[PDB]
Design an enzyme around this catalytic site. Structure first.
Site, short mmCIF file in Angstrom:
data_model
loop_
_atom_site.label_atom_id
_atom_site.label_comp_id
_atom_site.label_asym_id
_atom_site.label_seq_id
_atom_site.Cartn_x
_atom_site.Cartn_y
_atom_site.Cartn_z
N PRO A 9 0.82 -1.21 0.00
CA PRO A 9 0.00 0.00 0.00
C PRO A 9 0.86 1.27 0.00
CG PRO A 9 -0.62 -1.49 1.79
CD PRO A 9 0.73 -1.95 1.27
N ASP A 41 -3.65 4.31 -1.98
CA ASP A 41 -4.86 4.61 -1.23
C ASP A 41 -5.25 6.07 -1.47
OD1 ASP A 41 -7.06 4.00 0.36
OD2 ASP A 41 -5.87 3.63 2.20
N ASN A 68 -9.66 7.40 -0.29
CA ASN A 68 -8.71 7.04 0.76
C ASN A 68 -9.45 6.33 1.89
OD1 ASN A 68 -7.30 8.44 3.55
ND2 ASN A 68 -6.04 7.08 2.30
N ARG A 76 -4.42 -3.68 1.38
CA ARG A 76 -3.85 -5.03 1.54
C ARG A 76 -4.82 -6.10 1.02
NH1 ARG A 76 -1.33 -3.95 7.53
NH2 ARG A 76 0.86 -3.59 6.93
N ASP A 92 5.55 -2.46 3.99
CA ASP A 92 5.13 -1.09 4.24
C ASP A 92 5.97 -0.17 3.35
OD1 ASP A 92 3.24 -2.06 5.94
OD2 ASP A 92 4.27 -1.41 7.81
N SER A 93 5.34 0.89 2.85
CA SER A 93 5.89 1.71 1.77
C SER A 93 7.11 2.53 2.21
CB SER A 93 4.83 2.59 1.17
OG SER A 93 4.01 3.17 2.18
N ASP A 94 7.42 2.62 3.51
CA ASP A 94 8.67 3.31 3.89
C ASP A 94 9.87 2.35 4.06
OD1 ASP A 94 7.46 5.86 3.79
OD2 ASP A 94 6.76 5.66 5.86
N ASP A 181 -3.58 -5.92 11.85
CA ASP A 181 -2.48 -6.73 11.37
C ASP A 181 -2.24 -7.89 12.35
OD1 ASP A 181 -1.52 -4.83 13.26
OD2 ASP A 181 0.53 -4.95 12.46
O1 FQ8 Z 1 7.00 -12.16 30.02
P1 FQ8 Z 1 7.42 -13.04 28.75
O2 FQ8 Z 1 8.37 -14.18 29.35
O3 FQ8 Z 1 6.23 -13.62 28.08
O4 FQ8 Z 1 8.31 -12.14 27.78
C1 FQ8 Z 1 8.95 -10.95 28.24
C2 FQ8 Z 1 10.23 -10.73 27.43
O5 FQ8 Z 1 10.80 -9.46 27.76
C3 FQ8 Z 1 9.91 -10.78 25.93
O6 FQ8 Z 1 11.03 -11.34 25.24
C4 FQ8 Z 1 9.63 -9.39 25.37
O7 FQ8 Z 1 8.29 -9.00 25.65
C5 FQ8 Z 1 9.84 -9.40 23.85
O8 FQ8 Z 1 10.58 -8.24 23.48
P2 FQ8 Z 1 11.12 -8.03 21.98
O9 FQ8 Z 1 12.34 -7.20 21.96
O10 FQ8 Z 1 11.39 -9.51 21.41
O11 FQ8 Z 1 9.90 -7.42 21.14
C6 FQ8 Z 1 9.21 -6.27 21.64
C7 FQ8 Z 1 7.87 -6.07 20.93
O12 FQ8 Z 1 7.34 -7.33 20.52
C8 FQ8 Z 1 8.07 -5.17 19.72
O13 FQ8 Z 1 8.86 -4.04 20.10
C9 FQ8 Z 1 6.72 -4.67 19.21
O14 FQ8 Z 1 5.99 -4.06 20.27
C10 FQ8 Z 1 5.92 -5.84 18.64
O15 FQ8 Z 1 5.01 -5.34 17.67
P3 FQ8 Z 1 4.32 -6.32 16.60
O16 FQ8 Z 1 4.28 -7.76 17.33
O17 FQ8 Z 1 5.07 -6.36 15.33
O18 FQ8 Z 1 2.80 -5.82 16.47
C11 FQ8 Z 1 2.21 -5.58 15.20
C12 FQ8 Z 1 2.29 -4.09 14.85
O19 FQ8 Z 1 2.06 -3.92 13.45
C13 FQ8 Z 1 1.25 -3.29 15.64
O20 FQ8 Z 1 0.04 -4.04 15.74
C14 FQ8 Z 1 1.77 -2.96 17.04
O21 FQ8 Z 1 3.20 -2.94 17.05
C15 FQ8 Z 1 1.25 -1.59 17.46
O22 FQ8 Z 1 1.91 -1.18 18.66
#
Ligand code: FQ8
Ligand code: FQ8
Ligand code: FQ8
Ligand code: CL
Ligand code: CL
Ligand code: CL
Ligand code: CL
Ligand code: CL
Ligand code: MG
Lengths: 314, 315, 318
Positions: A9, A41, A68, A76, A92-94, A181
């Site tokens: 998109p 869009d 839009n 998507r 994602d477009s960026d 998503d």
């Molecule tokens: O307490 P447990 O043992 O279950 O785990 C705790 C640990 O510290 C665990 O490893 C961490 O929670 C994981 O940290 P990380 O560095 O692997 O990842 C951090 C987050 O998953 C990441 O920074 C994002 O917040 C994850 O976003 P997305 O899963 O890609 O969500 C989809 C995105 O498009 C959107 O819906 C959201 O990001 C909107 O905020």
């Protein structure tokens, strides 16, 4: 039949879109084995975005939406309808693809009969961070949601097997501007078995009231509890508990209770949160990381003071 | 009339019971001045326990119960009925008496006209711990419940004057599997004046639920305090009740239930029983509770699980 | 021959130590004919000891004897106001002292800056009730601001007030409660005037320390908030919210029984107290809450929710 359709998109991206499109056209994969589908869009940036896209006429598939939509879901979905490839990859477009992304991910997927292949994320500039724990065990041919931290990497910036999407009629929903998503990825995970993680390179570079939001969260829990793959009720509780943990660690407005939000909005927000969580069996609560025990119970009790207090103790 | 009856319930103790019985038979006190009463709560260990007891035939008194009661209360009551001594001493079947225990405790009691004599406890191995603060001031001829930490040492592993038990018809109760010993000691304390503490040796060596029944027992403890014919003054009763509340919050069963892995519904039921019991205790006692517990106590009175969880996080 | 200043001083069973106070007023750099001391005795009953002191200054002071002891300073202070036809009034507590330069320096600073209110730096003798400090930390201020110069933290009436503001707006001490009626007076005055001055060259006023359901108290607090929200000077609604928020902060930092929740107060009294507090605060717009110092966010919300456990918890976290 193409190996991969990349679905991208666009909206008011301007001249910076060159870098993204270029990263897709410069792949180790044979140019005839994949396609880039661009869905605009209805950009309104004095033709700047459309002029960039026009420079790649003959090299990309393109569809212009008449209005839009405001959200990535409609474009998507448009891209999905247009693709008849083996796998789709949302971009994602960026953002940028590494030159080896399509080939390495596709080959790993084909070798391991993968429904889903997740390539290691890199990031450029301060802003939204990327998942890390999922990639800390190196390459994984047959990953596990819990052991490989998949509920902490729920973006659709991944390679999905198209037949799973088609057979289960998985579409991006448009109810909310946020978490649609996650819902897509969750629906996919709950209807497939084989997930692969590939870490040789940074294959994908991220470049930097709650009525609707909690309806989406509600759909996530429903997808887990109706999974035809994870049928065992205790397993469903474990998965739900892990999602709850992720929601408390990373959810939208996770710290609303002590924020500058107006009182009446806090009440409404918590009311929606409470209603959603109270449809999730209490049997899932023991699988929530236990530092969150008080905060979770406060939300179940719909008690703003107790949520405020829980946040002060975290 | 014997000076002391030692009352010892047994159940499936086996060969290790020799060591305990031997510690009682080897006392500085004249052998004819005391007795060991053994009450077996229907052991079923292929005769192993009974065979040990039979080796002391002629040297101990023995009664076999026909059914296993499941707790120490029934065998202890049996022992009380059998004793016509001046003092009784309850002994758990895994524990040991120091060789000077009966003589030194009895003599100290007789010298100070004591209703209750408490000998310093020692402990062997990890497990159930023993009171310490009660013994940190040395020998005390006329102890005070509050100042000498007696509500922190409520086991019946002590020397009790039998006439106090007989006149006030003090019996071990059987409602719950837990805290019935505390209730006995509390009933005794609330019906007597003279308590002594003796610390020269480790005289006694400890060798290592919905709540419906438990909280019924706790309820009986508070009732005993508030009907004491010795501590008749209402403010003194409040002070004693407050001290028991403190001890309950420091050392009670499942004291940290609220943030535990107990199922939610069980936490609610547990707290409901706790709340009902505490809400029969006058609020005038609350100011005599050690004040770090002020929030936890109020949370329990309000029957508010979140508030109990929070109180525990701040303690 | 309108006087510059009337000093208004209630008395009750002060005895021989009253000499020191009266002497501090009669020994001023200001010309003796430019001011007066008005003494209102709230029916002393100390075997004539207080009256005998006052009689020694007959002809140098104005004096009125009340027939019954009112039990608070409000009635005698109101009596004093009715008797004064001066340009400014200054309220003095009968145990305290004025610096010799107080009337002259404060009056002159007021006249020079067209001040409705002049506040002289407080000093204190002995342990006991404390005095405001932050209000005096910026030195002399010709045109002070309630928020920036901490005036809601110095709401005693031990100050120089322009009498015309009191007369035009019919500002009287209220007698509903034994406490905070002085705050209400100062608040009513502040909300009906513009020009405030702070003078810090000396300790001009010396506080001398000598070694409840809340129904009435919270009715007084209620009147404070009403005065802010009906101010003809501070007419803008957002400004009113800011002022209300600052008063709320002061109330939470320094109010009566501020730590009642974890105290040994009987449960039923805690409940009644919090009930009165809650009722009063819930008449104050929530729009004021963002102007409360944010360490108090939980405590304030707990009071609004009338939730004793939550107030107890908030106090444990402060
Ligand atoms: O307490 P447990 O043992 O279950 O785990 C705790 C640990 O510290 C665990 O490893 C961490 O929670 C994981 O940290 P990380 O560095 O692997 O990842 C951090 C987050 O998953 C990441 O920074 C994002 O917040 C994850 O976003 P997305 O899963 O890609 O969500 C989809 C995105 O498009 C959107 O819906 C959201 O990001 C909107 O905020
Ligand atoms: O000044 P306060 O009262 O606020 O502070 C109390 C002090 O800190 C005090 O020194 C301690 O509470 C107690 O010190 P301690 O180390 O001498 O005593 C520890 C306990 O009392 C002890 O480990 C047990 O509680 C012993 O229980 P008992 O009363 O001897 O009998 C209970 C037992 O038979 C049974 O009923 C229960 O263990 C089963 O529920
Ligand atoms: O407003 P914020 O959150 O940014 O920070 C406030 C400061 O931390 C601090 O509170 C201020 O600078 C004021 O501190 P202070 O040391 O200058 O003064 C403290 C109090 O104002 C003072 O000790 C008295 O409590 C105030 O009493 P008054 O307003 O002079 O009169 C009240 C008195 O006559 C009567 O109404 C009752 O207090 C008697 O029970
Ligand atoms: Cl989210
Ligand atoms: Cl217990
Ligand atoms: Cl004189
Ligand atoms: Cl201001
Ligand atoms: Cl106050
Ligand atoms: Mg609460």
């Amino acid at each position: 039949m193409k190996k991969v359709s990349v679905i991208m998109p666009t909206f008011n991206n301007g001249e910076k879109l060159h870098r993204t499109i270029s990263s897709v056209l410069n792949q180790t994969m044979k140019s005839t084995d994949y396609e880039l589908i661009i869905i605009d869009d209805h950009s309104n940036d004095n033709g700047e975005t459309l002029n960039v896209i026009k420079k790649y006429k003959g090299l990309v598939r393109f569809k212009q939406l008449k209005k839009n939509s405001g959200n990535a879901s409609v474009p998507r979905n448009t891209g999905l309808k247009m693709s008849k490839a083996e796998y789709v990859f949302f971009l994602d477009s960026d953002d940028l693809l590494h030159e080896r992304a399509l080939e390495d991910l596709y080959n790993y997927g084909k070798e391991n009969n993968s429904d889903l292949i997740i390539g290691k994320y890199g990031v450029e500039g301060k802003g939204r961070s990327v998942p890390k724990a999922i990639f800390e065990k190196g390459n994984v041919a047959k990953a596990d949601i819990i052991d490989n931290s998949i509920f902490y990497a729920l973006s659709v910036l991944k390679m999905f097997k198209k037949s799973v999407i088609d057979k289960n009629k998985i579409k991006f929903k448009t109810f909310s501007k946020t978490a649609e998503d996650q819902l897509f990825t969750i629906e996919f995970l709950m209807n497939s078995k084989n997930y692969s993680i590939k870490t040789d390179y940074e294959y994908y570079i991220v470049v930097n009231t709650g009525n609707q939001y909690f309806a989406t969260i509600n759909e996530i829990y429903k997808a887990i509890y109706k999974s035809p793959i994870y049928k065992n009720q205790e397993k469903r509780h474990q998965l739900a508990g892990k999602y709850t943990t992720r929601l408390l660690r990373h959810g939208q407005k996770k710290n609303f209770a002590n924020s500058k939000m107006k009182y009446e909005d806090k009440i409404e927000w918590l009311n929606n949160f409470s209603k959603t969580i109270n449809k999730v069996p209490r049997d899932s609560d023991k699988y929530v990381t236990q530092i969150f025990n008080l905060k979770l119970e406060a939300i179940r009790q719909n008690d703003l003071l107790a949520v405020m207090i829980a946040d002060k103790l975290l």
